[PDB]
Amino acid sequence: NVDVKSRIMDQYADWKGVRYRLGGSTKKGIDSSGFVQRTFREQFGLELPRSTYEQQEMGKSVSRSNLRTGDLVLFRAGSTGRHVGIYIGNNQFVHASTSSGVIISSMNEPYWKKRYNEARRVLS
């Protein structure tokens, strides 16, 4: 009974442009795993682990061709080499980017295309 796309965009609209901060988890500064953890807690009542390393072990893996809104997409980015976002369809994803804060990006940007690693499904 959940409009998943609407709820993810609700979170994004509440967090748009919040600055990136490695280890942060407030609107004063948040990182990529932090934003994903907070989204799924507040919008879907799910408790993901805190770190990107643990988040890529959650749920089940999905191929890039089978991506669905709400899947986690993972890239080789940021100072830890592990960077996570939330797929929202149309080849787009929301994430706390290291350079620009919470933003929408596209899987088809060369920067992200060449850094894409894998994806996880945590929503039924």
UniProtKB/Swiss-Prot annotation:
The active site is at S32 (nucleophile), H83 (proton acceptor), H95. It comes from the Bacteria. Pathway: Cell wall biogenesis; cell wall polysaccharide biosynthesis. One of its GO terms (cellular component) is cell outer membrane. Disruption phenotype: Unable to grow on nutrient agar at 42 degrees Celsius. A triple mepS-mepH-mepM mutant is inviable, whereas a double mepS-mepM will grow on a nutrient-poor medium but not on a rich medium, suggesting the 3 endopeptidases are functionally redundant in vivo. Depletion experiments of the double or triple mutants lead to cell lysis, as well as significantly decreased incorporation of mDAP into peptidoglycan sacculi and increased amounts of the enzyme's substrate (Tetra-Tetra-anhydro muropeptide). It is a lipid-anchor. It is found in: Cell outer membrane. One of its GO terms (biological process) is proteolysis. Its main location: membrane. The keyword Cell wall biogenesis/degradation applies. Its EC number is 3.4.-.-, 3.4.17.13. One of its GO terms (molecular function) is endopeptidase activity. It is an enzyme of class 3 (hydrolase). It catalyses: N-acetyl-D-glucosaminyl-N-acetylmuramoyl-L-alanyl-meso-2,6-diaminoheptanedioyl-D-alanine + H2O = N-acetyl-D-glucosaminyl-N-acetylmuramoyl-L-alanyl-meso-2,6-diaminoheptanedioate + D-alanine. Residues 2-123 form the NlpC/P60 domain. The keyword Protease applies. Keywords: Cell outer membrane, Cell wall biogenesis/degradation, Hydrolase, Lipoprotein, Membrane, Palmitate, Protease, Signal, Thiol protease. Belongs to the peptidase C40 family. A murein DD-endopeptidase with specificity for D-Ala-meso-diaminopimelic acid (mDAP) cross-links. Its role is probably to cleave D-Ala-mDAP cross-links to allow insertion of new glycans and thus cell wall expansion. Functionally redundant with MepM and MepH. Also has weak LD-carboxypeptidase activity on L-mDAP-D-Ala peptide bonds. Partially suppresses a prc disruption mutant. Monomer. This is Murein DD-endopeptidase MepS/Murein LD-carboxypeptidase. It comes from Escherichia coli (strain K12).
